[PDB]
Enzyme design. Structure first.
Site, PDB file in Angstrom:
ATOM      1  N   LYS A 120       0.914  -1.032   0.058  1.00  0.00           N
ATOM      2  CA  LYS A 120       0.099   0.062  -0.059  1.00  0.00           C
ATOM      3  C   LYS A 120       0.745   1.345  -0.113  1.00  0.00           C
ATOM      4  CE  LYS A 120      -3.415   2.796   2.632  1.00  0.00           C
ATOM      5  NZ  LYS A 120      -4.085   2.895   3.689  1.00  0.00           N
ATOM      6  N   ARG A 131      -9.684  11.111   2.324  1.00  0.00           N
ATOM      7  CA  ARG A 131      -9.665  11.842   3.280  1.00  0.00           C
ATOM      8  C   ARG A 131     -10.683  12.934   3.758  1.00  0.00           C
ATOM      9  NH1 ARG A 131      -3.059  11.604   1.977  1.00  0.00           N
ATOM     10  NH2 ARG A 131      -2.728   9.374   2.445  1.00  0.00           N
ATOM     11  N   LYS A 190      -2.559  -1.505  -3.273  1.00  0.00           N
ATOM     12  CA  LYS A 190      -3.550  -0.271  -3.108  1.00  0.00           C
ATOM     13  C   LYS A 190      -2.695   0.813  -3.254  1.00  0.00           C
ATOM     14  CE  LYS A 190      -6.146   2.578   0.193  1.00  0.00           C
ATOM     15  NZ  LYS A 190      -6.512   2.551   1.504  1.00  0.00           N
TER      16      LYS A 190
END
Ligand SMILES: [Mg+2]
Ligand SMILES: [Mg+2]
Ligand SMILES: [Mg+2]
Ligand SMILES: [Mg+2]
Ligand SMILES: [Mg+2]
Ligand SMILES: [Mg+2]
Ligand code: NA
Ligand code: NA
Ligand code: NA
Ligand code: NA
Ligand code: NA
Ligand code: NA
Lengths: 328, 333, 333, 328, 328, 333
Positions: A203, A213, A253
């Site tokens: 990731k 976010r 990811k």
């Protein structure tokens, strides 16, 4: 791979493309609802939804609303949800204690869903960034460095609390070294024999997380724990460690900007492989579709790519849309 | 690969991540200006500059304007351009004859750039879709099927006209079977010994080309049409290896995957299996979706170099990208 | 492969097995209707329907009846049929001339289906065994040997007659050496540019074809005869790779393994080595043994989708199966 | 694999097929009696045989009858038997204690055969399903789930009792995670140094077991422990674990519907590889032969496949028939 | 590698070589400053530099001078230095105690650089040969043999003292078996979680070290611990052990005479791979350039080779020269 | 590779290093005289011996002197020489005609050595750079480009003249595309059935050839010129595999990598992938830099056998080295 001396005009690769029936027969990959995981943003309240500026069409949902929506998700055949609580500001702290609160949003949402839809998979987020005052990924030392093993201590308590809430899968998204093994040992000691661990293994320290976010209200960089976008070989070391430490599934990811990584991970390890089509990928696509710049068909094209690259399961904000197209 | 029994805590992969100097040392890939190809949309006429709503920040340019802009592309070190003419409506036809017109836009633009910037690489587009009334990449039979070998006869004439104009690289984007070999043999016979062929080898029947089709004005010609009988099914990965193998056998100097970021796994396979100069097109839809998100404030501009770094990591040597100038500016600084 | 040091109890492979949702997520392969080809037995005449005792639930159908049944095969989404004519006794001969008769059953059936269902895939059988008095797949010399190249001359005429009838796919099932290339060259020369060749590449000298030979009525012609001088020894696996490599070189669009479940290891090798469209025939004997067990109550009907799932897992893209309708019904629900 | 540019007509693959002598020379694989294991169903009584409706030609045999038949099996050269007791209903329980009864059918049959035919291999079945009231594979929790480690405790006691009875091979067919390592540790602690463990490593949740269930009188699904028929990569993880845990041989089950799995397992591990041609495969074939739909020759064809796929040994209800053809 | 039937004249490999723009596009590898590590020789004094006879253009520098020069190294972008103290003769001993002196040259230089240039990487030399009276690589037994484990004890104390001085990387150049694992364990016990270990993994018993020995003032053979130049397979065993023991990066030494080893190590392990272009390689090149026998361009040619061979980072006495050319 | 779970202290790799006898037993590679080719610079005239300042210890020799020196090269067991004529200034021209002169130095030297030492291998240099006024390896067009196929016509005549002189091996060092096949076909047609072709397959556009260009006197002809349009970019490794594959297809008996020690990774790849007789040139710049360091006292003479051992370990079968005599002397002792 053997080319087998195939040559034009004896070999014309357009012959199979000539008719729909031959394209369908040779078609190498397909998306089905079996492949889909829907991430959801969960509010603290009751009778509430909120829109997210950088995620057109995505809502934050209170738990009552989440149960209502989950009826349709279940009818569509979507196997699992990935829960992301939107933590009230008063419940953020340096020690991230809200991570393991048995009455935290994640834990409450988990119990509610496990009771109302016993067959629906619930993948919880093992992570301290929803609960820290700095949205930073763990416990900080005096230099502002995210302390590895001390953060894991907290993540382990959190993973245990998710198991006790009845989560079938816990998914550590934190990128601390060794956390998979620490969390597995704890689950095994506590008798949580069958709780799956979906490791966020490879990731990357990405700019594609911006809209997420905004969604979770945590809106600093993460290059000291998340991977350099430049690095591919390094991803194989990450996955090997996490498989040795006991992960039941391993994830790359972000998603489409890292399809080469999906391909390598599936090829080298032959293990259950997941990929996150992150908030930025969702927002890029949805923005272009709404602006009329791209056709809706790009959605399935993007999801088909993940299958073709070797992913077994895809975390995607388009899961509902994709499932409805597949139902029709 | 060999995990070599690496185990936490003896192996902690965060140690190399700890400081900038160690991240820099172990950093496996980097984008440079040497990797960049700028596709450009070229108008007929003089003193013409047109915005493209579906490609924010991209303009169609007449040749006089192209020559002026190219001064700074050259100064920024961009190795090559890929030309895409915007064909006047009245020049589209069944036979796509405008494809091989020594006075067509692509031919004119090539002659002008080769003279003004002798070191700049010019990649011409070998393709009939800009010149056909239907918007398909070749000549239709009476069933509306794109004929393979008859279309190649036209692509061959076109490639020759490009070579004669001085193009160093012709790039057949047509997805006819066998066209790389047919174009290579015609170039060889004609003495165009060093004209490179950049094959669009594994070009998918994609939805990500929408804004390009607006930009060259083929969108209205194509309508709802599809290219499923020639461009590759998005689901197919093994098939792409068979495509590339044939194009190498047929004499391609470079092989290309298209679109780009939705097909990074194909880039990885193609580089891994063939070890040949590998190219990738960051298509108009990829450019637009990034642009759109950046302009809305949803994504930082840093996603531009992140998207391009991905192509390098996946195994591309060169990248056709509408971001080439932005990126080359960012690297110069 | 890389075991990655996975050890109990840290790795417990039952965790993913624990619940349906996790089994569904990690499930590596699935059968869909896109994978299915239905072989059909086709009678001369009108209003003819005949049961086959050795293939319970399967009927031979005249063309008028085939057209009616095909309505629901199309509605269920089955991509293609494989036609097998049941040749009248008086039309069998030494020279197998009926193979290329524009008025033969296969040719007639093809014309009728292509007109009525323009999207339905028609796979014709390229083979002399339905037309020969001896039941062998080619012309015999004076030693009773099946001549290779002379038989190919006849198969070529037949394949051409099939193309002329509108078949999208011809499937040579004959196991003569070189026939794929000979058929491909004849198709190309004749302008049948897009007619696919589905090669029976690794077809074994098997005992599992018994009920098929009853169904087409070649069983009485063949008698105790064998095809050991052309169909492959069941013991041989490496040899199958050499077979497929030649058929790909010769221009096959698809390659097939036959029989099916007794040869899943060959499917796996062929897909692994060549990465090409791979097909597998679930033969009449495989169908009958499953049917027989299901009707006796010895096996649940769930073995049908289990047998078909195996072909997908082994690496087949498409499956010729007498269960195609049952399976497509089961998937629709 | 290198095609080596082989091309018609220089290469004609029919030249080697032209004559029996050249076919025999190049013939890549062959079945011999060395490859054959006969599973047998063992009754509690004396002077008894019973026919099985869904297994034409297969008998349950009391131990006296089993010794009589074993004379011919030994004369034929068959290396080993696989014993499956038919447990009286009174001896079934929730705790499966009959599994480790020193006077259970399996243990009695083992002693008798070891004494009468010292060179004949005896492979016992390590399994709780012959002894549970629910024919289920182990000890159940309150939800009806087969408990992993608690069942192994019982299997370990059973495997020890088989070793003490003199079984040269114990073959855990249970698909509990980690049982191979648990059983090996116990055998080693108890000084049973040379007792082989034949792991059922990759044993699918199959519909082909129906007739076996009629044979043993246990006639619910097993998807929580037996493998999904869809999964191939997953089989390699199963075998790797079992080899690490100490198995001397590894088995794929069922057989012909999983030949691709046999091929992968042999290719990747190069270890002694076994395959079970299960009751359903036997019954399908035998049914078609008796109905006159297929020739007897399919039997050897099916067994030749297993060799070709990479199996070293085959558990088959046709072992006697095959051995008699090979003797002739 | 698949040749894909490429044939003249369809394939003419000169077409891509025809123009600078096509050569630049296909160019497979490039040197950047990110790849460069500068080794430096450090004097005890103040306001001192010394020239080295067999290393034209290379200076020994006292620490004040080292800080002055490091300003330009930092401006050029050079990521790291590799420190080699020039030990005063009075501070050499049989026990090599000066190795772990908190006021040794290495430790003093480290503190000074860490304070003045916090972003500059400092790789210290873990080694006893700078501190022994015999310049030999460790503690000697009565036969003059370098004792393996007893020397490691000293190296471990030294590595700890480097970590305490703030070195971000310690690089054991000693070729004792197992030292990487011993040093990693100690660092981990002492809480030096993030201190990288750059193993000299495959370090040959070479004649190319001569000028380095003049540089450090140690100016006997090392075939009982350093590798035989003949051996390549053996290098893979060395690297595998060092990766298992916890090295964060692995190094081949010497450099250009061992490019095949670099290639194998990168191919087989896919780990961060370093290579030392040693003093002899530097001196050979610099000698020929100064004599006018070779053009300056050989310097970049030699460094490009390391990248092409698979090295990520290169220890090179040409680091400054190379960085200045890359800046221009 | 398979680490086999080897772990300290059970595995201690110093045990085999402990004593000379065990190091000798496990020693993976060794140089012998069988691996050595001596390149020699050959003057016109009689009784000529010239030092080369940029190659200390190496002399240019007239043929009479070459014959005398070769007595001890033969006695030391050196299998072959590679001849490099030093062309008189007045014999250089645009057309490089001196290349195929039956009375050129290379041809004369070959005839003399083949007669005097019938067992000694003679490798001639197929190349136009010694004969051209510009110092390039072929004929220039009007843009100063080295023409490919026209230069091959000349190299073919030259190779034939070498065969006619009795050379057992011709080594094309020119880096024209296709020249190995063109030279092979000419040799075959002419009955030169057994003349070996040692292809300079992966020869890089290197700076390490400087002292050689002084030695043959092409340095003044070349001036500041480069060979970037034919000799390979130093950065490129995959490309070298494509080079070798073509040269093997074209009929090379041996394939060579050049320069040597800066390209050991390429030697390793070439041997690993092709398993063919593999050769490597320890170039003049490599010789000079070692010599220079040894004469200054900076490196022990033991670096000579260390540099040569490296080529063996990397996978070379034979090494062209100016150190061949020194090395063969060292091995004899
Ligand atoms: Mg990790
Ligand atoms: Mg193509
Ligand atoms: Mg064949
Ligand atoms: Mg298991
Ligand atoms: Mg070591
Ligand atoms: Mg070449
Ligand atoms: Na899936
Ligand atoms: Na590039
Ligand atoms: Na399919
Ligand atoms: Na065997
Ligand atoms: Na680097
Ligand atoms: Na040799």
């Amino acid at each position: 791979f053997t080319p087998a001396n195939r040559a034009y005009p004896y070999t014309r690769l357009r012959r199979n493309r000539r008719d729909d029936f031959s394209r369908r027969l040779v078609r190498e990959n397909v998306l089905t609802v079996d492949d889909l995981i829907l991430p959801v943003f969960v509010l603290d309240g009751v009778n509430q939804r909120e829109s997210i500026p950088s995620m057109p069409g995505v809502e934050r949902l209170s738990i009552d609303q989440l149960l209502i929506e989950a009826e349709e998700w279940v009818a569509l055949g979507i196997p699992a949800l990935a829960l992301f609580p939107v933590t009230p500001v008063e419940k953020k702290s340096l020690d991230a204690a809200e991570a393991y609160n048995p009455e935290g949003i994640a834990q409450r949402a988990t119990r509610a869903l496990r009771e109302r839809f016993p067959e629906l998979g619930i993948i919880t987020d093992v992570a301290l960034d929803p609960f820290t005052t700095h949205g930073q990924d763990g416990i900080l030392d005096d230099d502002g460095y995210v302390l590895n093993d001390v953060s894991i201590d907290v993540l382990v308590r959190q993973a245990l609390s998710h198991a006790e809430a009845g989560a079938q899968v816990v998914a550590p998204s934190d990128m601390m070294d060794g956390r998979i093994g620490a969390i597995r040992e704890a689950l095994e000691s506590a008798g949580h024999t069958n709780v799956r661990v979906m490791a966020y293994s490879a990731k990357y320290a990405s700019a594609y997380y911006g809209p997420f976010r905004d969604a979770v209200g945590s809106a600093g960089n993460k290059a000291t724990y998340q991977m350099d976008p430049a690095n591919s070989d390094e991803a194989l070391h990450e996955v090997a460690a996490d498989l040795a430490e006991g992960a039941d599934m391993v994830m790359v990811k972000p998603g489409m900007p890292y399809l080469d990584i999906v391909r390598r991970v599936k090829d080298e390890f032959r293990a259950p492989t997941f990929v996150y089509q992150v908030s930025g990928e969702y927002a890029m696509h949805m923005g272009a579709i709404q602006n009329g710049w791209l056709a809706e068909s790009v959605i399935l094209e993007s999801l088909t790519a993940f299958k073709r690259a070797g992913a077994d399961g895809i975390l995607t904000y388009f899961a509902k849309q994709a499932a409805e197209q597949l139902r029709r």
